[PDB]
Amino acid sequence: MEDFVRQCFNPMIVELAEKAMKEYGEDPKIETNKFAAICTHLEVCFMYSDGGSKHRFEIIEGRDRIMAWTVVNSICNTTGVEKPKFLPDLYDYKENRFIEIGVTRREVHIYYLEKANKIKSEKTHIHIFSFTGEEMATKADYTLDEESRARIKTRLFTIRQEMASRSLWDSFRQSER
Amino acid sequence: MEDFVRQCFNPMIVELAEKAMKEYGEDPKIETNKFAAICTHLEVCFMYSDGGSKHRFEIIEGRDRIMAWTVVNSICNTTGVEKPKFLPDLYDYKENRFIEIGVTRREVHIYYLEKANKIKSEKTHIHIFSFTGEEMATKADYTLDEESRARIKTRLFTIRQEMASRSLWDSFRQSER
Ligand SMILES: O=C(O)c1nc([C@@H]2CCCN2C(=O)COc2cccc3ccccc23)[nH]c(=O)c1O
Ligand SMILES: O=C(O)c1nc([C@@H]2CCCN2C(=O)COc2cccc3ccccc23)[nH]c(=O)c1O
Ligand SMILES: [Mn+2]
Ligand SMILES: [Mn+2]
Ligand SMILES: [Mn+2]
Ligand SMILES: [Mn+2]
Protein backbone atom coordinates (compact mmCIF):
# COMPACT_ATOMS: atom_id res chain seq x y z
CA MET A 1 0.00 0.00 0.00
CA GLU A 2 2.91 2.35 0.72
CA ASP A 3 4.38 1.68 -2.74
CA PHE A 4 0.95 2.35 -4.26
CA VAL A 5 0.68 5.77 -2.60
CA ARG A 6 4.08 7.04 -3.75
CA GLN A 7 3.20 5.68 -7.24
CA CYS A 8 -0.31 7.02 -7.89
CA PHE A 9 0.11 10.38 -6.12
CA ASN A 10 2.48 13.21 -7.03
CA PRO A 11 5.54 13.85 -4.80
CA MET A 12 4.01 17.13 -3.59
CA ILE A 13 0.91 15.40 -2.20
CA VAL A 14 2.97 12.56 -0.72
CA GLU A 15 5.28 15.00 1.07
CA LEU A 16 2.32 16.96 2.44
CA ALA A 17 0.73 13.75 3.73
CA GLU A 18 3.98 12.56 5.33
CA LYS A 19 4.31 15.86 7.20
CA ALA A 20 0.71 15.76 8.44
CA MET A 21 1.15 12.23 9.80
CA LYS A 22 4.48 12.96 11.49
CA GLU A 23 2.91 16.03 13.13
CA TYR A 24 0.67 13.56 15.01
CA GLY A 25 3.27 10.89 15.80
CA GLU A 26 2.09 8.50 13.09
CA ASP A 27 4.48 6.64 10.79
CA PRO A 28 3.32 6.53 7.14
CA LYS A 29 5.07 3.15 6.89
CA ILE A 30 2.68 1.60 9.44
CA GLU A 31 -0.64 3.46 9.10
CA THR A 32 -0.61 3.14 5.32
CA ASN A 33 -4.40 3.42 5.00
CA LYS A 34 -4.57 6.82 6.67
CA PHE A 35 -1.54 7.72 4.54
CA ALA A 36 -3.64 7.03 1.43
CA ALA A 37 -6.71 8.78 2.86
CA ILE A 38 -4.77 12.01 3.40
CA CYS A 39 -3.33 11.86 -0.12
CA THR A 40 -6.79 11.23 -1.58
CA HIS A 41 -8.34 14.12 0.35
CA LEU A 42 -5.51 16.42 -0.76
CA GLU A 43 -5.90 15.40 -4.40
CA VAL A 44 -9.66 16.05 -4.35
CA CYS A 45 -9.16 19.49 -2.79
CA PHE A 46 -6.65 20.40 -5.51
CA MET A 47 -8.92 19.18 -8.32
CA TYR A 48 -11.86 21.03 -6.75
CA SER A 49 -10.01 24.36 -6.92
CA ASP A 50 -9.24 23.75 -10.63
CA GLY A 51 -12.85 23.03 -11.64
CA GLY A 52 -14.19 26.58 -11.92
CA SER A 53 -13.07 29.87 -13.41
CA LYS A 54 -9.57 31.15 -12.75
CA HIS A 55 -9.09 32.52 -9.21
CA ARG A 56 -12.58 31.35 -8.22
CA PHE A 57 -11.23 29.29 -5.30
CA GLU A 58 -8.55 29.89 -2.70
CA ILE A 59 -6.79 26.77 -1.45
CA ILE A 60 -6.55 26.43 2.34
CA GLU A 61 -5.75 22.73 2.72
CA GLY A 62 -2.12 21.75 2.21
CA ARG A 63 -0.79 25.03 3.60
CA ASP A 64 0.93 25.09 6.96
CA ARG A 65 -1.06 26.37 9.93
CA ILE A 66 0.20 29.97 9.96
CA MET A 67 -0.31 30.56 6.23
CA ALA A 68 -3.69 28.80 6.31
CA TRP A 69 -4.98 31.16 9.01
CA THR A 70 -3.33 34.09 7.22
CA VAL A 71 -5.50 33.34 4.19
CA VAL A 72 -8.62 32.72 6.30
CA ASN A 73 -8.24 35.92 8.32
CA SER A 74 -7.47 37.95 5.19
CA ILE A 75 -10.74 36.80 3.63
CA CYS A 76 -12.76 37.57 6.76
CA ASN A 77 -11.31 41.10 6.81
CA THR A 78 -11.84 41.77 3.09
CA THR A 79 -15.29 40.21 2.61
CA GLY A 80 -16.63 40.38 6.18
CA VAL A 81 -17.63 36.70 6.21
CA GLU A 82 -17.59 35.15 9.68
CA LYS A 83 -14.33 33.59 10.88
CA PRO A 84 -14.49 29.78 11.17
CA LYS A 85 -13.45 28.03 14.36
CA PHE A 86 -11.65 25.34 12.35
CA LEU A 87 -9.64 25.53 9.15
CA PRO A 88 -11.83 24.85 6.09
CA ASP A 89 -10.49 23.46 2.80
CA LEU A 90 -11.41 26.13 0.24
CA TYR A 91 -13.03 29.53 -0.12
CA ASP A 92 -15.49 30.25 -2.94
CA TYR A 93 -14.87 33.80 -4.14
CA LYS A 94 -17.94 33.56 -6.38
CA GLU A 95 -20.33 32.39 -3.64
CA ASN A 96 -18.53 34.17 -0.75
CA ARG A 97 -18.38 31.09 1.47
CA PHE A 98 -15.87 28.64 2.90
CA ILE A 99 -15.89 25.03 1.68
CA GLU A 100 -15.21 21.85 3.64
CA ILE A 101 -14.39 18.84 1.45
CA GLY A 102 -14.74 15.26 2.65
CA VAL A 103 -13.73 11.97 1.04
CA THR A 104 -15.31 8.91 2.64
CA ARG A 105 -15.06 5.19 1.96
CA ARG A 106 -18.34 4.50 3.80
CA GLU A 107 -21.71 6.05 3.01
CA VAL A 108 -21.91 9.66 1.89
CA HIS A 109 -24.83 10.58 4.16
CA ILE A 110 -23.15 9.41 7.38
CA TYR A 111 -20.10 11.53 6.60
CA TYR A 112 -22.19 14.64 5.89
CA LEU A 113 -24.03 14.47 9.22
CA GLU A 114 -20.81 13.66 11.08
CA LYS A 115 -19.11 16.69 9.48
CA ALA A 116 -22.12 19.01 9.73
CA ASN A 117 -22.71 18.56 13.47
CA LYS A 118 -18.94 18.78 14.02
CA ILE A 119 -18.39 21.99 12.04
CA LYS A 120 -21.47 23.63 13.64
CA SER A 121 -20.71 26.82 11.68
CA GLU A 122 -23.83 27.81 9.77
CA LYS A 123 -22.05 29.48 6.84
CA THR A 124 -19.38 26.90 5.96
CA HIS A 125 -20.38 24.87 2.90
CA ILE A 126 -19.91 21.09 2.94
CA HIS A 127 -19.30 18.86 -0.08
CA ILE A 128 -18.67 15.12 0.34
CA PHE A 129 -17.33 12.71 -2.27
CA SER A 130 -16.96 8.93 -2.21
CA PHE A 131 -15.07 6.26 -4.13
CA THR A 132 -18.26 4.64 -5.46
CA GLY A 133 -19.52 7.78 -7.23
CA GLU A 134 -21.86 9.47 -4.72
CA GLU A 135 -21.69 13.13 -3.77
CA MET A 136 -23.82 15.35 -1.56
CA ALA A 137 -23.47 19.02 -0.66
CA THR A 138 -25.11 21.60 1.58
CA LYS A 139 -28.70 22.15 0.39
CA ALA A 140 -27.94 20.36 -2.91
CA ASP A 141 -25.59 23.21 -3.93
CA TYR A 142 -22.76 21.32 -5.63
CA THR A 143 -20.89 24.54 -6.54
CA LEU A 144 -19.08 22.97 -9.51
CA ASP A 145 -20.43 21.97 -12.91
CA GLU A 146 -21.34 18.37 -13.70
CA GLU A 147 -18.19 18.03 -15.83
CA SER A 148 -15.84 19.12 -13.04
CA ARG A 149 -17.56 16.86 -10.52
CA ALA A 150 -17.39 13.97 -13.01
CA ARG A 151 -13.59 14.10 -13.31
CA ILE A 152 -13.38 14.08 -9.50
CA LYS A 153 -15.73 11.11 -9.14
CA THR A 154 -13.96 9.29 -11.98
CA ARG A 155 -10.60 9.95 -10.31
CA LEU A 156 -11.83 8.41 -7.05
CA PHE A 157 -13.23 5.50 -9.05
CA THR A 158 -9.85 4.93 -10.71
CA ILE A 159 -8.09 4.95 -7.32
CA ARG A 160 -10.54 2.40 -5.91
CA GLN A 161 -9.98 0.10 -8.90
CA GLU A 162 -6.18 0.21 -8.72
CA MET A 163 -6.16 -0.77 -5.04
CA ALA A 164 -8.75 -3.47 -5.77
CA SER A 165 -6.40 -4.76 -8.47
CA ARG A 166 -3.66 -4.66 -5.79
CA SER A 167 -5.86 -6.40 -3.15
CA LEU A 168 -5.68 -3.27 -0.98
CA TRP A 169 -9.20 -1.82 -1.30
CA ASP A 170 -11.11 -3.77 1.35
CA SER A 171 -8.40 -3.12 3.94
CA PHE A 172 -8.60 0.58 3.02
CA ARG A 173 -12.41 0.78 2.97
CA GLN A 174 -12.55 -0.97 6.36
CA SER A 175 -10.24 1.32 8.37
CA GLU A 176 -12.36 4.50 8.21
CA ARG A 177 -13.78 6.17 11.32
CA MET B 1 7.67 52.35 4.91
CA GLU B 2 6.55 49.47 7.13
CA ASP B 3 2.97 50.77 7.13
CA PHE B 4 3.14 51.07 3.34
CA VAL B 5 4.17 47.43 2.91
CA ARG B 6 1.37 45.98 5.05
CA GLN B 7 -1.03 48.32 3.17
CA CYS B 8 -0.16 47.78 -0.50
CA PHE B 9 0.64 44.04 -0.27
CA ASN B 10 -1.71 41.21 0.68
CA PRO B 11 -1.30 39.54 4.10
CA MET B 12 -0.06 36.34 2.43
CA ILE B 13 2.88 38.11 0.77
CA VAL B 14 3.65 40.11 3.92
CA GLU B 15 3.73 36.95 6.05
CA LEU B 16 6.00 35.20 3.53
CA ALA B 17 8.37 38.17 3.53
CA GLU B 18 8.43 38.37 7.33
CA LYS B 19 9.38 34.69 7.56
CA ALA B 20 12.16 35.03 4.98
CA MET B 21 13.70 37.97 6.85
CA LYS B 22 13.49 36.31 10.26
CA GLU B 23 15.16 33.21 8.79
CA TYR B 24 18.24 35.42 8.27
CA GLY B 25 18.13 37.34 11.56
CA GLU B 26 16.71 40.52 10.02
CA ASP B 27 13.89 42.51 11.61
CA PRO B 28 11.27 43.74 9.10
CA LYS B 29 10.78 46.75 11.39
CA ILE B 30 14.36 47.94 10.80
CA GLU B 31 15.32 46.79 7.28
CA THR B 32 12.08 48.07 5.81
CA ASN B 33 13.52 48.50 2.30
CA LYS B 34 14.52 44.85 1.97
CA PHE B 35 11.10 44.06 3.47
CA ALA B 36 9.49 45.87 0.53
CA ALA B 37 11.89 44.32 -2.00
CA ILE B 38 10.94 40.79 -0.93
CA CYS B 39 7.23 41.63 -1.12
CA THR B 40 7.68 43.16 -4.58
CA HIS B 41 9.62 40.15 -5.87
CA LEU B 42 6.97 37.80 -4.47
CA GLU B 43 4.15 39.78 -6.08
CA VAL B 44 5.85 39.75 -9.49
CA CYS B 45 6.42 35.99 -9.30
CA PHE B 46 2.74 35.43 -8.50
CA MET B 47 1.55 37.68 -11.33
CA TYR B 48 4.00 35.98 -13.71
CA SER B 49 2.45 32.56 -13.04
CA ASP B 50 -1.03 33.98 -13.78
CA GLY B 51 -0.11 35.50 -17.15
CA GLY B 52 -0.29 32.42 -19.36
CA SER B 53 -2.63 29.49 -19.87
CA LYS B 54 -3.90 27.54 -16.88
CA HIS B 55 -1.27 25.24 -15.34
CA ARG B 56 1.41 26.65 -17.64
CA PHE B 57 3.65 27.64 -14.71
CA GLU B 58 4.56 25.96 -11.44
CA ILE B 59 5.32 28.32 -8.57
CA ILE B 60 8.55 27.62 -6.69
CA GLU B 61 9.10 30.92 -4.87
CA GLY B 62 7.11 31.40 -1.67
CA ARG B 63 7.17 27.71 -0.78
CA ASP B 64 9.28 26.50 2.11
CA ARG B 65 12.59 24.83 1.29
CA ILE B 66 11.45 21.19 1.47
CA MET B 67 8.35 21.68 -0.70
CA ALA B 68 10.29 23.87 -3.15
CA TRP B 69 12.85 21.13 -3.75
CA THR B 70 10.06 18.54 -3.83
CA VAL B 71 8.57 20.40 -6.80
CA VAL B 72 11.96 20.94 -8.46
CA ASN B 73 13.03 17.30 -8.11
CA SER B 74 9.62 16.06 -9.28
CA ILE B 75 9.98 18.08 -12.49
CA CYS B 76 13.53 16.85 -13.12
CA ASN B 77 12.32 13.25 -12.76
CA THR B 78 9.23 13.67 -14.96
CA THR B 79 10.68 15.83 -17.76
CA GLY B 80 14.38 14.94 -17.46
CA VAL B 81 15.47 18.60 -17.36
CA GLU B 82 18.71 19.17 -15.46
CA LYS B 83 18.48 19.82 -11.72
CA PRO B 84 19.41 23.40 -10.75
CA LYS B 85 21.98 24.06 -8.05
CA PHE B 86 19.81 26.87 -6.62
CA LEU B 87 16.06 27.20 -6.28
CA PRO B 88 14.53 28.99 -9.28
CA ASP B 89 11.27 30.96 -9.14
CA LEU B 90 9.05 29.23 -11.71
CA TYR B 91 8.95 26.35 -14.16
CA ASP B 92 7.54 26.79 -17.66
CA TYR B 93 5.64 23.62 -18.56
CA LYS B 94 5.17 24.92 -22.11
CA GLU B 95 8.85 25.71 -22.72
CA ASN B 96 10.25 22.97 -20.41
CA ARG B 97 12.59 25.30 -18.54
CA PHE B 98 13.04 26.86 -15.12
CA ILE B 99 12.57 30.61 -14.71
CA GLU B 100 14.46 33.03 -12.47
CA ILE B 101 12.66 36.34 -11.90
CA GLY B 102 14.43 39.49 -10.76
CA VAL B 103 13.08 42.88 -9.70
CA THR B 104 15.71 45.63 -9.61
CA ARG B 105 15.59 49.31 -8.70
CA ARG B 106 18.83 50.00 -10.60
CA GLU B 107 19.48 49.27 -14.27
CA VAL B 108 18.02 46.16 -15.86
CA HIS B 109 21.22 45.15 -17.68
CA ILE B 110 23.42 45.17 -14.56
CA TYR B 111 20.97 42.86 -12.79
CA TYR B 112 20.84 40.41 -15.72
CA LEU B 113 24.62 40.00 -15.87
CA GLU B 114 24.86 39.77 -12.08
CA LYS B 115 22.19 37.04 -12.06
CA ALA B 116 23.45 35.25 -15.18
CA ASN B 117 27.05 34.79 -14.00
CA LYS B 118 25.72 33.84 -10.54
CA ILE B 119 23.24 31.21 -11.74
CA LYS B 120 25.81 29.72 -14.17
CA SER B 121 23.24 27.08 -15.16
CA GLU B 122 22.88 27.12 -18.94
CA LYS B 123 19.23 26.02 -19.06
CA THR B 124 17.63 28.28 -16.44
CA HIS B 125 15.76 31.17 -18.06
CA ILE B 126 16.18 34.68 -16.65
CA HIS B 127 13.62 37.50 -16.81
CA ILE B 128 14.29 40.84 -15.11
CA PHE B 129 11.78 43.61 -14.41
CA SER B 130 12.26 47.13 -13.09
CA PHE B 131 10.14 49.87 -11.55
CA THR B 132 10.73 52.27 -14.46
CA GLY B 133 9.28 49.94 -17.12
CA GLU B 134 12.29 48.06 -18.54
CA GLU B 135 12.45 44.29 -18.95
CA MET B 136 15.01 41.94 -20.45
CA ALA B 137 15.05 38.16 -20.72
CA THR B 138 17.35 35.38 -21.88
CA LYS B 139 17.91 35.74 -25.64
CA ALA B 140 14.97 38.18 -25.90
CA ASP B 141 12.54 35.36 -25.03
CA TYR B 142 10.03 37.15 -22.79
CA THR B 143 7.85 34.03 -22.39
CA LEU B 144 4.67 36.01 -21.65
CA ASP B 145 2.51 38.06 -23.99
CA GLU B 146 2.82 41.84 -24.18
CA GLU B 147 -0.45 42.21 -22.25
CA SER B 148 0.70 40.07 -19.31
CA ARG B 149 4.06 41.84 -19.17
CA ALA B 150 2.28 45.21 -19.31
CA ARG B 151 0.22 44.56 -16.17
CA ILE B 152 3.43 43.56 -14.37
CA LYS B 153 5.31 46.67 -15.50
CA THR B 154 2.31 48.86 -14.68
CA ARG B 155 2.08 47.26 -11.23
CA LEU B 156 5.74 48.07 -10.52
CA PHE B 157 5.12 51.59 -11.82
CA THR B 158 2.18 52.03 -9.43
CA ILE B 159 4.30 50.84 -6.48
CA ARG B 160 7.08 53.29 -7.36
CA GLN B 161 4.59 56.17 -7.53
CA GLU B 162 2.95 55.41 -4.17
CA MET B 163 6.29 55.38 -2.36
CA ALA B 164 7.30 58.55 -4.21
CA SER B 165 4.06 60.11 -2.97
CA ARG B 166 5.09 58.88 0.51
CA SER B 167 8.69 60.20 0.17
CA LEU B 168 10.00 56.63 0.41
CA TRP B 169 11.14 55.90 -3.16
CA ASP B 170 14.65 57.37 -3.19
CA SER B 171 15.52 55.64 0.08
CA PHE B 172 14.23 52.39 -1.44
CA ARG B 173 15.93 52.82 -4.83
CA GLN B 174 19.22 53.62 -3.07
CA SER B 175 19.52 50.55 -0.81
CA GLU B 176 19.87 47.90 -3.55
CA ARG B 177 22.98 45.73 -3.91
O1 LIG C 1 -11.57 16.49 5.33
C1 LIG C 1 -11.51 16.06 6.50
O2 LIG C 1 -12.03 15.01 6.91
C2 LIG C 1 -10.74 16.90 7.50
N1 LIG C 1 -10.71 16.46 8.77
C3 LIG C 1 -10.05 17.16 9.68
C4 LIG C 1 -10.04 16.63 11.10
C5 LIG C 1 -10.93 17.39 12.10
C6 LIG C 1 -10.03 18.54 12.53
C7 LIG C 1 -8.72 17.83 12.77
N2 LIG C 1 -8.71 16.80 11.72
C8 LIG C 1 -7.66 16.07 11.32
O3 LIG C 1 -7.80 15.12 10.56
C9 LIG C 1 -6.30 16.45 11.85
O4 LIG C 1 -5.31 15.50 11.45
C10 LIG C 1 -5.26 14.32 12.13
C11 LIG C 1 -6.08 13.98 13.17
C12 LIG C 1 -5.93 12.73 13.79
C13 LIG C 1 -4.98 11.85 13.38
C14 LIG C 1 -4.11 12.17 12.31
C15 LIG C 1 -3.10 11.28 11.85
C16 LIG C 1 -2.29 11.63 10.82
C17 LIG C 1 -2.43 12.87 10.19
C18 LIG C 1 -3.39 13.76 10.60
C19 LIG C 1 -4.25 13.43 11.67
N3 LIG C 1 -9.40 18.32 9.35
C20 LIG C 1 -9.41 18.80 8.06
O5 LIG C 1 -8.81 19.85 7.78
C21 LIG C 1 -10.11 18.05 7.12
O6 LIG C 1 -10.12 18.52 5.86
O1 LIG D 1 15.09 37.11 -7.19
C1 LIG D 1 16.14 37.20 -6.54
O2 LIG D 1 16.91 38.18 -6.54
C2 LIG D 1 16.52 36.02 -5.67
N1 LIG D 1 17.68 36.11 -5.00
C3 LIG D 1 18.05 35.09 -4.22
C4 LIG D 1 19.36 35.23 -3.48
C5 LIG D 1 20.52 34.39 -4.03
C6 LIG D 1 20.29 33.04 -3.37
C7 LIG D 1 20.00 33.44 -1.94
N2 LIG D 1 19.25 34.69 -2.11
C8 LIG D 1 18.53 35.32 -1.17
O3 LIG D 1 18.08 36.45 -1.37
C9 LIG D 1 18.29 34.61 0.13
O4 LIG D 1 17.63 35.45 1.07
C10 LIG D 1 18.39 36.40 1.71
C11 LIG D 1 19.73 36.58 1.52
C12 LIG D 1 20.40 37.58 2.24
C13 LIG D 1 19.74 38.38 3.13
C14 LIG D 1 18.35 38.21 3.35
C15 LIG D 1 17.62 39.02 4.26
C16 LIG D 1 16.29 38.83 4.44
C17 LIG D 1 15.61 37.83 3.73
C18 LIG D 1 16.27 37.03 2.84
C19 LIG D 1 17.66 37.21 2.63
N3 LIG D 1 17.27 33.98 -4.10
C20 LIG D 1 16.07 33.86 -4.77
O5 LIG D 1 15.39 32.83 -4.64
C21 LIG D 1 15.71 34.93 -5.58
O6 LIG D 1 14.54 34.81 -6.24
MN1 LIG E 1 -9.03 20.20 5.77
MN1 LIG F 1 -11.71 18.22 4.27
MN1 LIG G 1 13.69 33.05 -5.78
MN1 LIG H 1 13.95 35.76 -8.22
Author numbering:
A (entry chain A), B (entry chain A): 1 to 53, 73 to 196
Study authors write:
The essential endonuclease domain within the PA subunit is a particularly attractive drug target. The chemical scaffold for our studies is 4,5-dihydroxypyrimidine-6-carboxamide (DHPC), which was originally developed by Summa and coworkers (Merck, Italy) into the first-in-class HIV two-metal integrase inhibitor raltegravir (Isentriss)30.
For carboxylate analogs (e.g. general structure 6R = OH: 6b: R1 = naphthalen-1-oxymethyl, 6c: R1 = 4-chorobenzyl, and 6d: R1 = phenoxymethyl), we generally observed the DHPC warhead engaging the two-metal center, as expected, and the R1 group stacking onto Tyr24 in the crystal structures of the inhibitors in the PAN binding site (Supplementary Results). As anticipated for a carboxylate, no significant activity was observed in the viral plaque inhibition assay at 50 μM.
